[PDB]
Amino acid sequence: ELTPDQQTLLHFIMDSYNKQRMPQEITNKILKEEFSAEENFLILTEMATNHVQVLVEFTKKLPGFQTLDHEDQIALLKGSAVEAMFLRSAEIFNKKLPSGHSDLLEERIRNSGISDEYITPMFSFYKSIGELKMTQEEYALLTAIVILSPDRQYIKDREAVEKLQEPLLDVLQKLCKIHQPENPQHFACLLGRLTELRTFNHHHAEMLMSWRVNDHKFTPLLCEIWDVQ
């Protein structure tokens, strides 16, 4: 029922997760710039390359992350990049965060060179995850769990990560049985979405190919993290 070691872990996490890292002058472009396929794409590239920085600075703050093998630290970042980004945007659409300009962010994604084959699943995903009516603690706990996934390919010590992940799952499960006793299946549902999240890694690899064969520019930072040759 939320011990000390936990009421403290959660607070350190809600602390990081809550730092307003993305600059207002930057996210404001989602609202003020012209709406065209090219501009929508450039702005989305700028949000994503800025978000990569917020993630790393959030990940660094995750308990015991900095004690992991430097090679694994990369594998984890490269592995969860896409998923963590879907989680953040999902929160923008689901909980209508002001800094996200939800409806205008959606206009730009729906017209940035992405095939209907991916737009449909993508938004279908956002709708059902919103129906879980999650809290900021769940979103944050969820992201930290995704980043610390011992599953990611190329990990050298898949047990030192599980060990760093376990505490987080525990606090999430607890927080579920606590304010959601109504139904003891909520923890399971959240974890279910994790599986659905994974699905977009493939989709994202195809989206990048399409953008690339169409002469689209990313950033040195995005290219490194997504392995864009």
Partner: peptide, 11 residues
Amino acid sequence: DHQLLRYLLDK
């Protein structure tokens, strides 16, 4: 390789 990510971590 991955000098950008490494650079962000060491920052």
